[PDB]
Amino acid sequence: HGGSSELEEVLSDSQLPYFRRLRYASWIEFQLLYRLAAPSVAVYMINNAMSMSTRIFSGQLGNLQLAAASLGNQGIQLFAYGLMLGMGSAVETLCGQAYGAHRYEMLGVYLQRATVVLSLTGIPLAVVYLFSKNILLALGESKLVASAAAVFVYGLIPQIFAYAVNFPIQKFLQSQSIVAPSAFISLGTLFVHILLSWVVVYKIGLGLLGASLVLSFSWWIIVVAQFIYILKSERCKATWAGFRWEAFSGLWQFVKLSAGSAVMLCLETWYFQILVLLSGLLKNPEIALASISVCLAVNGLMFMVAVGFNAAASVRVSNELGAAHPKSAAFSVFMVTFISFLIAVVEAIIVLSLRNVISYAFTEGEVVAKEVSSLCPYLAVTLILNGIQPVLSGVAVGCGWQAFVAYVNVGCYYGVGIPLGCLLGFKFDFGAKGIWTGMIGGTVMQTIILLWVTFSTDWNKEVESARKRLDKWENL
Ligand SMILES: CCCCCCCC/C=C/CCCCCCCC(=O)OC[C@H](O)CO
């Protein structure tokens, strides 16, 4: 329980040579990164598999049912997904810093205080789900498609409040460096999800409504399974003191800290969505929509590995800033960035080697395979950029820089990325290469700013700022 972190700090405090000290602080760091990032990827892959399993099981009832599962997941759910996870960012930085400062008693307070805030946030998301039929026909979709997706969206209204409890519990167990139980109950519920969705759809005949209800039901099985763990777990007897009335105090404070990360995700959900819509306005958008969707799907599939390093870099900096280990935090930021950078290099190598094959996997098109292969050099740059940007955003969450990063991300995306992509794409007639270059240029500037800031960071002041943050939340 934080003993390894103390040892790493002790190792840096020695007269031993730099190379001997580097090898033997990297080994203890690499062991901590692996014990955190490996189950984090396994959790997101199994959970997204349920979103794919529900999309697959519901899509086998007709082409209208598949469009309902696709438009419901990417249209309104992806908007509701980024809003719930954004508020769960303040409980991520508060639990990790408190777990490092041995204030285990208030870890359960942050869980409930995040649940109350997220449960109130899921109320505006509920009325949007009810009128999902009206917003789809407003975008021009057919009434039969809008009513079909709404019924599928009607079944996802319990998935909203399931997020409001799963995300605080996820970051709660993440701070204590215990993410293994979450990966195994998700594996079991997936078998329960595939089995129950097969019984509800094929035998009960509830249609696409029951298909989305089984998804929302399975999401509530991992919520109950995660809560009954912390009640019986021995590593959670110091961190979960039980239900407390203090969770209702200082709700607006949790709103202000988490508001930065929430806007960063929903706008980015629209930012990529705007980049797709803008690609439809380019000259010859017939192939620009398919090629960009292939590269972004590869970018999205490669992004699933980056979120594991994001969770690891977040808890490491949080646990070290709370335990007053500034040199260990400056090393964890460096170590996560380097290992994730080498992974992004391997991701770019595989894409460049299979530049002609990856296009046929998503859609069989000969002219599409050429256009995708032409954008693979640009996609490889985005993959390398997506191997440093999320880990620098994860350490910024651990330091509480969520407001500073949100200003930079929105400014680099909407203020720099979008105008550069439209100027290169439309005015300069570079097509999809101009859009992707503008998206690259946006991510480049963001990473550069964060890199200079993070490496010029006074980690002594971040430790003091972590004490002030924990002390103020303890007073109220
Ligand atoms: C849909 C699910 C919703 C889930 C959440 C429902 C409750 C949210 C309400 C909280 C404030 C009102 C209730 C608490 C009123 C007393 C608060 C209190 O003790 O205030 C102390 C004061 O702030 C000095 O420290």
Short mmCIF file of C-alpha atoms and ligand atoms in Angstrom, two decimals:
data_model
loop_
_atom_site.label_atom_id
_atom_site.label_comp_id
_atom_site.label_asym_id
_atom_site.label_seq_id
_atom_site.Cartn_x
_atom_site.Cartn_y
_atom_site.Cartn_z
CA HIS A 1 0.00 0.00 0.00
CA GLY A 2 2.33 2.70 -1.27
CA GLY A 3 5.47 0.98 0.05
CA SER A 4 6.92 0.72 -3.45
CA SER A 5 6.43 4.46 -4.01
CA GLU A 6 8.38 5.24 -0.83
CA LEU A 7 11.22 2.96 -1.95
CA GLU A 8 11.46 4.65 -5.35
CA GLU A 9 11.87 8.05 -3.67
CA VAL A 10 14.56 6.60 -1.39
CA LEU A 11 16.48 5.25 -4.40
CA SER A 12 16.71 8.70 -5.98
CA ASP A 13 18.12 9.91 -2.63
CA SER A 14 21.57 8.35 -2.94
CA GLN A 15 25.13 9.08 -4.02
CA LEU A 16 25.02 6.13 -6.42
CA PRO A 17 25.88 6.78 -10.09
CA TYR A 18 23.16 8.14 -12.35
CA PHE A 19 23.01 5.07 -14.60
CA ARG A 20 22.87 2.64 -11.67
CA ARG A 21 20.19 4.82 -10.07
CA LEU A 22 18.31 5.08 -13.38
CA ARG A 23 18.14 1.33 -14.04
CA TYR A 24 17.00 0.51 -10.51
CA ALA A 25 14.37 3.26 -10.31
CA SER A 26 13.08 2.36 -13.79
CA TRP A 27 12.58 -1.29 -12.82
CA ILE A 28 10.44 -0.42 -9.80
CA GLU A 29 8.60 2.17 -11.91
CA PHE A 30 8.00 -0.19 -14.84
CA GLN A 31 6.50 -2.74 -12.43
CA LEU A 32 4.03 -0.14 -11.13
CA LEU A 33 3.08 1.02 -14.64
CA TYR A 34 2.43 -2.55 -15.80
CA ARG A 35 0.32 -3.43 -12.76
CA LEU A 36 -1.89 -0.41 -13.56
CA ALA A 37 -2.09 -0.03 -17.34
CA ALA A 38 -2.59 -3.69 -18.28
CA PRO A 39 -5.95 -4.18 -16.48
CA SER A 40 -7.06 -0.69 -17.54
CA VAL A 41 -6.96 -1.67 -21.21
CA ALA A 42 -8.73 -4.95 -20.43
CA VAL A 43 -11.60 -3.08 -18.75
CA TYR A 44 -12.25 -0.68 -21.63
CA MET A 45 -11.98 -3.43 -24.26
CA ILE A 46 -14.52 -5.69 -22.53
CA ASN A 47 -16.89 -2.79 -21.87
CA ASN A 48 -16.73 -1.59 -25.48
CA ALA A 49 -17.23 -5.22 -26.52
CA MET A 50 -20.61 -5.08 -24.77
CA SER A 51 -21.37 -1.97 -26.82
CA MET A 52 -20.33 -3.99 -29.87
CA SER A 53 -22.18 -7.09 -28.65
CA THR A 54 -25.38 -5.08 -28.20
CA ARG A 55 -24.78 -3.44 -31.59
CA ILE A 56 -24.17 -6.86 -33.16
CA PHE A 57 -27.04 -8.69 -31.45
CA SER A 58 -29.51 -5.90 -32.21
CA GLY A 59 -28.19 -5.46 -35.76
CA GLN A 60 -29.13 -9.04 -36.67
CA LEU A 61 -32.85 -8.16 -36.73
CA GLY A 62 -32.66 -6.04 -39.90
CA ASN A 63 -30.82 -3.10 -41.42
CA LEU A 64 -33.14 -0.65 -39.66
CA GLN A 65 -32.18 -2.17 -36.30
CA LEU A 66 -28.44 -1.84 -37.00
CA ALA A 67 -28.82 1.84 -37.88
CA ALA A 68 -30.66 2.34 -34.58
CA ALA A 69 -27.82 0.72 -32.62
CA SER A 70 -25.20 2.70 -34.56
CA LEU A 71 -26.87 6.12 -34.46
CA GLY A 72 -27.88 5.63 -30.82
CA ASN A 73 -24.33 4.77 -29.75
CA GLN A 74 -22.41 7.41 -31.71
CA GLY A 75 -25.06 10.13 -31.78
CA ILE A 76 -26.51 10.65 -28.31
CA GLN A 77 -24.69 8.04 -26.21
CA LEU A 78 -21.23 9.28 -27.24
CA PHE A 79 -22.44 12.73 -26.17
CA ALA A 80 -23.71 11.32 -22.87
CA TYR A 81 -20.59 9.16 -22.46
CA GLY A 82 -18.19 12.11 -22.51
CA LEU A 83 -20.33 14.09 -20.07
CA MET A 84 -20.31 11.41 -17.36
CA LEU A 85 -16.60 10.60 -17.59
CA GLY A 86 -15.74 14.30 -17.49
CA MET A 87 -17.31 14.82 -14.08
CA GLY A 88 -15.54 11.69 -12.84
CA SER A 89 -12.20 13.40 -13.35
CA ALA A 90 -12.31 15.38 -10.10
CA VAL A 91 -12.87 12.22 -8.06
CA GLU A 92 -9.92 10.72 -9.95
CA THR A 93 -7.46 13.40 -8.81
CA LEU A 94 -8.91 13.68 -5.29
CA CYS A 95 -8.87 9.95 -4.49
CA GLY A 96 -5.33 9.42 -5.78
CA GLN A 97 -3.88 12.33 -3.81
CA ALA A 98 -5.80 11.29 -0.69
CA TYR A 99 -4.64 7.68 -1.01
CA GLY A 100 -1.06 8.95 -1.11
CA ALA A 101 -1.56 11.18 1.94
CA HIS A 102 -2.89 8.18 3.95
CA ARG A 103 -6.27 9.94 4.27
CA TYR A 104 -8.03 6.69 3.41
CA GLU A 105 -11.20 7.63 5.30
CA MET A 106 -12.16 10.35 2.80
CA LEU A 107 -11.70 8.13 -0.26
CA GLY A 108 -15.19 6.73 0.30
CA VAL A 109 -16.42 10.29 0.81
CA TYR A 110 -15.16 11.28 -2.64
CA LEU A 111 -16.92 8.24 -4.12
CA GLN A 112 -20.32 9.24 -2.72
CA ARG A 113 -19.75 12.95 -3.39
CA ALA A 114 -18.95 12.11 -7.01
CA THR A 115 -22.01 9.83 -7.19
CA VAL A 116 -24.32 12.63 -6.00
CA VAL A 117 -22.93 15.07 -8.58
CA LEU A 118 -23.00 12.50 -11.38
CA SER A 119 -26.52 11.40 -10.42
CA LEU A 120 -27.71 14.99 -10.82
CA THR A 121 -25.88 15.31 -14.15
CA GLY A 122 -27.73 12.25 -15.47
CA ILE A 123 -31.06 14.08 -15.16
CA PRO A 124 -30.57 16.50 -18.10
CA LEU A 125 -29.17 13.55 -20.06
CA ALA A 126 -32.44 11.68 -19.43
CA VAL A 127 -34.69 14.22 -21.15
CA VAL A 128 -32.31 14.34 -24.12
CA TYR A 129 -32.68 10.57 -24.44
CA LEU A 130 -36.48 10.93 -24.40
CA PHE A 131 -36.46 13.47 -27.25
CA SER A 132 -33.79 11.59 -29.22
CA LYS A 133 -36.43 10.88 -31.87
CA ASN A 134 -37.07 14.60 -32.36
CA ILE A 135 -33.39 15.56 -32.59
CA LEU A 136 -32.82 12.86 -35.22
CA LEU A 137 -35.65 14.04 -37.48
CA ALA A 138 -34.29 17.56 -36.96
CA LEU A 139 -30.96 16.44 -38.45
CA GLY A 140 -32.87 15.02 -41.44
CA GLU A 141 -33.17 11.33 -40.55
CA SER A 142 -36.27 9.40 -41.55
CA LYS A 143 -39.19 9.13 -39.14
CA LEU A 144 -38.89 5.33 -39.22
CA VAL A 145 -35.17 5.57 -38.42
CA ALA A 146 -35.69 8.25 -35.76
CA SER A 147 -38.45 6.27 -34.02
CA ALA A 148 -36.34 3.10 -34.21
CA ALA A 149 -33.23 4.69 -32.70
CA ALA A 150 -35.35 6.35 -30.00
CA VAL A 151 -36.70 2.97 -28.88
CA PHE A 152 -33.09 1.79 -28.74
CA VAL A 153 -32.22 5.02 -26.91
CA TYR A 154 -35.19 4.51 -24.56
CA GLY A 155 -33.47 1.30 -23.45
CA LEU A 156 -30.22 3.17 -22.76
CA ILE A 157 -31.73 5.60 -20.22
CA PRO A 158 -30.69 3.24 -17.37
CA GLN A 159 -27.19 3.13 -18.88
CA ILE A 160 -26.98 6.85 -18.04
CA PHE A 161 -27.41 6.45 -14.28
CA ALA A 162 -25.27 3.31 -14.44
CA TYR A 163 -22.40 5.53 -15.61
CA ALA A 164 -23.04 7.93 -12.72
CA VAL A 165 -22.08 5.20 -10.23
CA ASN A 166 -19.56 3.10 -12.19
CA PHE A 167 -17.22 5.99 -13.01
CA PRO A 168 -16.74 7.15 -9.37
CA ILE A 169 -16.18 3.54 -8.30
CA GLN A 170 -13.74 3.03 -11.19
CA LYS A 171 -11.54 5.95 -10.13
CA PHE A 172 -11.98 4.95 -6.47
CA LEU A 173 -10.43 1.51 -7.01
CA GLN A 174 -8.00 3.07 -9.50
CA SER A 175 -6.50 5.36 -6.86
CA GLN A 176 -5.73 2.42 -4.55
CA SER A 177 -3.96 0.64 -7.45
CA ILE A 178 -6.58 -2.14 -7.40
CA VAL A 179 -7.97 -2.49 -10.93
CA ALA A 180 -7.73 -6.30 -11.26
CA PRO A 181 -11.18 -7.12 -9.75
CA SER A 182 -12.88 -4.76 -12.21
CA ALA A 183 -11.40 -6.60 -15.20
CA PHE A 184 -12.59 -10.04 -14.05
CA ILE A 185 -16.16 -9.09 -13.16
CA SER A 186 -16.41 -7.35 -16.54
CA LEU A 187 -15.25 -10.58 -18.18
CA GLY A 188 -17.94 -12.57 -16.37
CA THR A 189 -20.73 -10.06 -17.00
CA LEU A 190 -19.85 -10.12 -20.71
CA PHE A 191 -20.67 -13.83 -20.76
CA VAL A 192 -23.83 -12.92 -18.84
CA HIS A 193 -24.44 -10.09 -21.33
CA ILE A 194 -24.00 -12.29 -24.41
CA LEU A 195 -26.16 -15.03 -22.87
CA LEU A 196 -28.96 -12.76 -21.63
CA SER A 197 -29.07 -10.69 -24.83
CA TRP A 198 -29.39 -13.97 -26.73
CA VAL A 199 -32.31 -15.07 -24.55
CA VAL A 200 -34.07 -11.69 -24.57
CA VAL A 201 -33.78 -11.12 -28.33
CA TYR A 202 -34.02 -14.60 -29.86
CA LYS A 203 -36.44 -16.23 -27.39
CA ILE A 204 -38.30 -13.44 -25.57
CA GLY A 205 -38.58 -11.30 -28.70
CA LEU A 206 -38.28 -7.88 -27.06
CA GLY A 207 -36.54 -6.60 -30.20
CA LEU A 208 -34.04 -3.77 -30.23
CA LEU A 209 -35.58 -2.31 -27.06
CA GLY A 210 -34.68 -5.37 -25.01
CA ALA A 211 -31.27 -5.46 -26.69
CA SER A 212 -30.42 -2.03 -25.27
CA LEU A 213 -32.04 -2.93 -21.94
CA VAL A 214 -29.77 -5.97 -21.54
CA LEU A 215 -26.83 -3.64 -22.17
CA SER A 216 -28.05 -1.25 -19.48
CA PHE A 217 -28.75 -4.25 -17.23
CA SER A 218 -25.26 -5.70 -17.73
CA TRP A 219 -23.79 -2.29 -16.91
CA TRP A 220 -25.65 -2.46 -13.60
CA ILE A 221 -24.20 -5.90 -12.88
CA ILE A 222 -20.65 -4.52 -12.88
CA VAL A 223 -21.86 -1.62 -10.73
CA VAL A 224 -23.28 -3.99 -8.10
CA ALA A 225 -20.27 -6.30 -8.42
CA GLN A 226 -17.87 -3.39 -7.87
CA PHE A 227 -19.80 -2.15 -4.83
CA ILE A 228 -20.10 -5.56 -3.16
CA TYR A 229 -16.33 -5.88 -3.60
CA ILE A 230 -15.42 -2.75 -1.61
CA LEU A 231 -17.82 -3.98 1.08
CA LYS A 232 -16.02 -7.33 1.36
CA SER A 233 -12.52 -6.35 0.21
CA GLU A 234 -9.79 -6.02 2.83
CA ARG A 235 -7.91 -3.33 0.89
CA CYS A 236 -11.10 -1.21 0.98
CA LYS A 237 -11.79 -1.37 4.74
CA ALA A 238 -9.59 1.68 5.33
CA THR A 239 -10.77 3.51 2.19
CA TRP A 240 -14.53 2.84 2.51
CA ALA A 241 -15.85 3.86 5.93
CA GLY A 242 -19.46 3.57 4.75
CA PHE A 243 -22.18 5.98 3.75
CA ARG A 244 -21.69 9.47 5.18
CA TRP A 245 -23.85 12.60 5.24
CA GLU A 246 -20.75 14.72 4.49
CA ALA A 247 -21.09 13.71 0.82
CA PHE A 248 -23.89 16.27 0.44
CA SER A 249 -21.59 19.08 1.63
CA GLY A 250 -19.58 20.98 -0.96
CA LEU A 251 -21.26 19.63 -4.09
CA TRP A 252 -20.62 22.79 -6.05
CA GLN A 253 -16.88 22.50 -5.33
CA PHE A 254 -16.80 19.11 -7.04
CA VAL A 255 -18.66 20.71 -9.95
CA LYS A 256 -16.06 23.43 -10.56
CA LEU A 257 -13.03 21.13 -10.62
CA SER A 258 -14.68 18.51 -12.84
CA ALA A 259 -16.29 21.02 -15.22
CA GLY A 260 -13.03 21.45 -17.13
CA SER A 261 -12.68 17.83 -18.22
CA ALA A 262 -16.38 17.50 -19.12
CA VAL A 263 -16.40 20.24 -21.77
CA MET A 264 -13.13 18.88 -23.18
CA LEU A 265 -14.75 15.54 -24.08
CA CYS A 266 -18.18 16.53 -25.45
CA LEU A 267 -16.57 19.21 -27.61
CA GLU A 268 -13.97 16.69 -28.79
CA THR A 269 -16.82 14.29 -29.52
CA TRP A 270 -18.30 17.06 -31.66
CA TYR A 271 -14.83 18.11 -32.87
CA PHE A 272 -14.26 14.74 -34.54
CA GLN A 273 -17.93 14.80 -35.56
CA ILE A 274 -17.44 18.26 -37.07
CA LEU A 275 -14.32 17.02 -38.88
CA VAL A 276 -16.44 14.22 -40.35
CA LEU A 277 -19.22 16.64 -41.31
CA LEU A 278 -16.72 19.10 -42.80
CA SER A 279 -15.22 16.25 -44.85
CA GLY A 280 -18.67 15.91 -46.42
CA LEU A 281 -18.41 19.52 -47.63
CA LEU A 282 -15.06 18.99 -49.37
CA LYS A 283 -14.91 18.45 -53.11
CA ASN A 284 -15.43 14.75 -53.85
CA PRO A 285 -16.60 13.82 -50.32
CA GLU A 286 -17.55 10.37 -51.64
CA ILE A 287 -14.10 8.98 -50.81
CA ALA A 288 -13.08 11.57 -48.20
CA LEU A 289 -15.73 10.28 -45.78
CA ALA A 290 -14.66 6.64 -46.10
CA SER A 291 -10.90 7.20 -45.94
CA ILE A 292 -11.07 9.49 -42.90
CA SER A 293 -13.46 7.09 -41.17
CA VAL A 294 -10.98 4.24 -41.75
CA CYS A 295 -8.02 6.22 -40.41
CA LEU A 296 -10.02 7.46 -37.42
CA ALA A 297 -11.34 3.96 -36.70
CA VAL A 298 -7.72 2.78 -36.67
CA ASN A 299 -6.98 5.85 -34.54
CA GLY A 300 -9.90 4.89 -32.30
CA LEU A 301 -8.77 1.27 -32.03
CA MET A 302 -5.21 2.39 -31.26
CA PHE A 303 -6.63 4.91 -28.76
CA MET A 304 -7.86 1.97 -26.66
CA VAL A 305 -4.26 1.17 -25.71
CA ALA A 306 -3.49 4.81 -24.88
CA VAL A 307 -6.27 5.04 -22.28
CA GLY A 308 -4.50 2.39 -20.21
CA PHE A 309 -1.39 4.56 -19.98
CA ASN A 310 -3.70 7.50 -19.26
CA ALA A 311 -5.12 5.75 -16.19
CA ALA A 312 -1.63 4.69 -15.07
CA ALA A 313 -0.08 8.15 -15.45
CA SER A 314 -3.03 9.64 -13.55
CA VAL A 315 -2.84 7.42 -10.46
CA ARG A 316 0.97 7.50 -10.33
CA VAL A 317 1.17 11.30 -10.24
CA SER A 318 -1.83 11.43 -7.90
CA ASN A 319 -0.37 8.87 -5.49
CA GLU A 320 3.05 10.55 -5.56
CA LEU A 321 1.82 14.14 -5.18
CA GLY A 322 -0.26 12.99 -2.21
CA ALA A 323 2.63 11.04 -0.67
CA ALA A 324 4.96 14.05 -1.18
CA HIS A 325 7.27 12.32 -3.65
CA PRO A 326 8.14 15.09 -6.14
CA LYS A 327 11.10 13.36 -7.80
CA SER A 328 9.06 10.17 -8.19
CA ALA A 329 6.31 12.20 -9.87
CA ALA A 330 8.80 13.85 -12.24
CA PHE A 331 10.13 10.38 -13.06
CA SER A 332 6.72 8.75 -13.49
CA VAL A 333 5.77 11.52 -15.92
CA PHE A 334 8.97 10.78 -17.85
CA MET A 335 8.66 6.99 -17.65
CA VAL A 336 5.01 6.82 -18.73
CA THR A 337 5.70 9.24 -21.59
CA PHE A 338 8.69 7.24 -22.85
CA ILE A 339 7.06 3.80 -22.68
CA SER A 340 3.87 5.11 -24.28
CA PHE A 341 5.97 6.84 -26.95
CA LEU A 342 7.68 3.57 -27.87
CA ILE A 343 4.25 1.90 -28.06
CA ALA A 344 3.01 4.63 -30.41
CA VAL A 345 6.10 4.01 -32.55
CA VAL A 346 5.18 0.32 -32.84
CA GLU A 347 1.61 1.32 -33.71
CA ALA A 348 2.89 3.50 -36.55
CA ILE A 349 5.12 0.70 -37.85
CA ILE A 350 2.26 -1.80 -38.13
CA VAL A 351 -0.01 0.71 -39.90
CA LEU A 352 2.66 1.65 -42.45
CA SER A 353 3.42 -2.02 -43.15
CA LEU A 354 -0.28 -2.85 -43.66
CA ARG A 355 -1.30 0.40 -45.35
CA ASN A 356 -3.08 -1.42 -48.19
CA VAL A 357 -4.66 -4.15 -46.05
CA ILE A 358 -6.21 -2.05 -43.26
CA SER A 359 -8.47 -0.23 -45.72
CA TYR A 360 -9.99 -3.43 -47.13
CA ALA A 361 -10.75 -4.62 -43.58
CA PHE A 362 -13.24 -1.80 -42.98
CA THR A 363 -14.57 -1.59 -46.55
CA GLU A 364 -13.52 -3.36 -49.76
CA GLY A 365 -12.61 -0.52 -52.11
CA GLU A 366 -9.66 -0.33 -54.49
CA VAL A 367 -9.61 3.46 -54.81
CA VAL A 368 -10.30 3.68 -51.07
CA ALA A 369 -7.25 1.52 -50.33
CA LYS A 370 -5.07 3.96 -52.28
CA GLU A 371 -6.45 7.01 -50.47
CA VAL A 372 -6.05 5.34 -47.07
CA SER A 373 -2.47 4.35 -47.94
CA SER A 374 -1.80 7.98 -48.87
CA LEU A 375 -3.06 9.11 -45.44
CA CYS A 376 -1.19 6.42 -43.48
CA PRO A 377 1.95 8.61 -43.24
CA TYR A 378 -0.33 11.29 -41.80
CA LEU A 379 -2.14 8.70 -39.66
CA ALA A 380 1.20 7.43 -38.34
CA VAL A 381 1.98 10.95 -37.12
CA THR A 382 -1.42 11.10 -35.39
CA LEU A 383 -0.72 7.72 -33.78
CA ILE A 384 2.60 8.96 -32.39
CA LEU A 385 0.86 12.15 -31.25
CA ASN A 386 -1.83 9.98 -29.62
CA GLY A 387 0.92 8.21 -27.66
CA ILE A 388 2.13 11.33 -25.83
CA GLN A 389 -0.95 13.55 -25.67
CA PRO A 390 -3.11 11.30 -23.43
CA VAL A 391 -0.27 10.52 -21.02
CA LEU A 392 0.51 14.24 -20.67
CA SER A 393 -3.22 14.77 -20.08
CA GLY A 394 -3.24 11.99 -17.48
CA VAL A 395 -0.47 13.58 -15.43
CA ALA A 396 -2.31 16.90 -15.75
CA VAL A 397 -5.40 15.32 -14.17
CA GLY A 398 -3.25 14.04 -11.31
CA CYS A 399 -1.97 17.58 -10.75
CA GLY A 400 -5.44 19.12 -11.01
CA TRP A 401 -4.56 20.98 -14.23
CA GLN A 402 -7.90 19.98 -15.79
CA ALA A 403 -8.96 23.60 -16.31
CA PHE A 404 -5.63 24.61 -17.86
CA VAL A 405 -5.60 21.64 -20.25
CA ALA A 406 -9.26 22.16 -21.21
CA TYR A 407 -8.47 25.72 -22.29
CA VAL A 408 -5.48 24.53 -24.33
CA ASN A 409 -7.30 21.57 -25.90
CA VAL A 410 -10.36 23.57 -26.98
CA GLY A 411 -8.13 26.38 -28.24
CA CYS A 412 -5.91 24.01 -30.20
CA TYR A 413 -8.85 22.02 -31.60
CA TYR A 414 -11.45 24.67 -32.42
CA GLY A 415 -9.26 27.77 -32.59
CA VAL A 416 -6.27 26.31 -34.45
CA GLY A 417 -7.12 22.84 -35.74
CA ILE A 418 -10.49 23.54 -37.38
CA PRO A 419 -9.48 26.79 -39.18
CA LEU A 420 -6.23 25.22 -40.40
CA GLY A 421 -8.06 22.17 -41.74
CA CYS A 422 -10.64 24.31 -43.54
CA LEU A 423 -7.98 26.60 -45.04
CA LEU A 424 -5.85 23.69 -46.26
CA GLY A 425 -8.87 21.61 -47.24
CA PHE A 426 -11.17 24.12 -48.94
CA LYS A 427 -9.12 27.18 -49.90
CA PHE A 428 -5.86 25.35 -50.64
CA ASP A 429 -7.75 22.37 -52.13
CA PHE A 430 -5.67 19.78 -50.28
CA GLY A 431 -8.76 17.69 -49.55
CA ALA A 432 -8.71 15.23 -46.67
CA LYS A 433 -4.93 15.66 -46.38
CA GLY A 434 -5.59 19.29 -45.47
CA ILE A 435 -8.09 18.32 -42.78
CA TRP A 436 -5.78 15.71 -41.26
CA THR A 437 -2.86 18.15 -41.39
CA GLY A 438 -4.97 20.68 -39.50
CA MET A 439 -5.87 18.00 -36.95
CA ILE A 440 -2.19 17.08 -36.69
CA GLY A 441 -1.20 20.73 -36.30
CA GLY A 442 -3.74 21.07 -33.50
CA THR A 443 -2.44 18.02 -31.63
CA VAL A 444 1.17 19.11 -32.26
CA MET A 445 0.66 22.52 -30.64
CA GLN A 446 -1.24 21.00 -27.70
CA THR A 447 1.51 18.47 -26.99
CA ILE A 448 4.29 21.06 -27.32
CA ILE A 449 2.62 23.42 -24.84
CA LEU A 450 1.94 20.60 -22.38
CA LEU A 451 5.44 19.15 -22.80
CA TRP A 452 7.23 22.41 -21.99
CA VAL A 453 4.82 23.13 -19.12
CA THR A 454 5.05 19.63 -17.63
CA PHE A 455 8.84 19.42 -17.81
CA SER A 456 9.21 23.01 -16.55
CA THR A 457 6.81 22.18 -13.70
CA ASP A 458 8.02 22.81 -10.15
CA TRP A 459 7.06 19.49 -8.60
CA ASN A 460 7.74 20.97 -5.16
CA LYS A 461 4.86 23.40 -5.69
CA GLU A 462 2.57 20.65 -7.00
CA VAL A 463 3.13 18.69 -3.78
CA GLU A 464 2.23 21.80 -1.78
CA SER A 465 -0.80 22.41 -4.00
CA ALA A 466 -1.84 18.80 -3.39
CA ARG A 467 -1.71 19.41 0.37
CA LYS A 468 -3.77 22.60 0.08
CA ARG A 469 -6.33 20.79 -2.07
CA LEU A 470 -6.66 17.87 0.34
CA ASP A 471 -6.71 20.13 3.41
CA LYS A 472 -9.44 22.39 2.01
CA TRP A 473 -11.66 19.45 1.05
CA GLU A 474 -11.19 18.05 4.57
CA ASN A 475 -12.32 21.32 6.20
CA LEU A 476 -15.46 22.34 4.27
C1 LIG B 1 -31.33 11.48 -9.10
C2 LIG B 1 -30.34 11.11 -8.03
C3 LIG B 1 -29.96 12.25 -7.12
C4 LIG B 1 -28.94 11.89 -6.06
C5 LIG B 1 -28.64 13.00 -5.09
C6 LIG B 1 -29.86 13.52 -4.37
C7 LIG B 1 -29.59 14.59 -3.32
C8 LIG B 1 -28.87 15.80 -3.83
C9 LIG B 1 -29.05 16.99 -2.94
C10 LIG B 1 -28.16 17.55 -2.17
C11 LIG B 1 -28.40 18.77 -1.34
C12 LIG B 1 -29.65 18.68 -0.51
C13 LIG B 1 -29.63 17.57 0.54
C14 LIG B 1 -28.69 17.82 1.69
C15 LIG B 1 -29.04 19.04 2.51
C16 LIG B 1 -28.08 19.31 3.66
C17 LIG B 1 -26.67 19.51 3.19
C18 LIG B 1 -25.72 19.84 4.30
O1 LIG B 1 -25.50 19.15 5.26
O2 LIG B 1 -25.12 21.01 4.10
C19 LIG B 1 -24.10 21.39 5.05
C20 LIG B 1 -23.54 22.73 4.65
O3 LIG B 1 -23.13 22.68 3.28
C21 LIG B 1 -22.38 23.18 5.52
O4 LIG B 1 -21.29 22.27 5.46
#
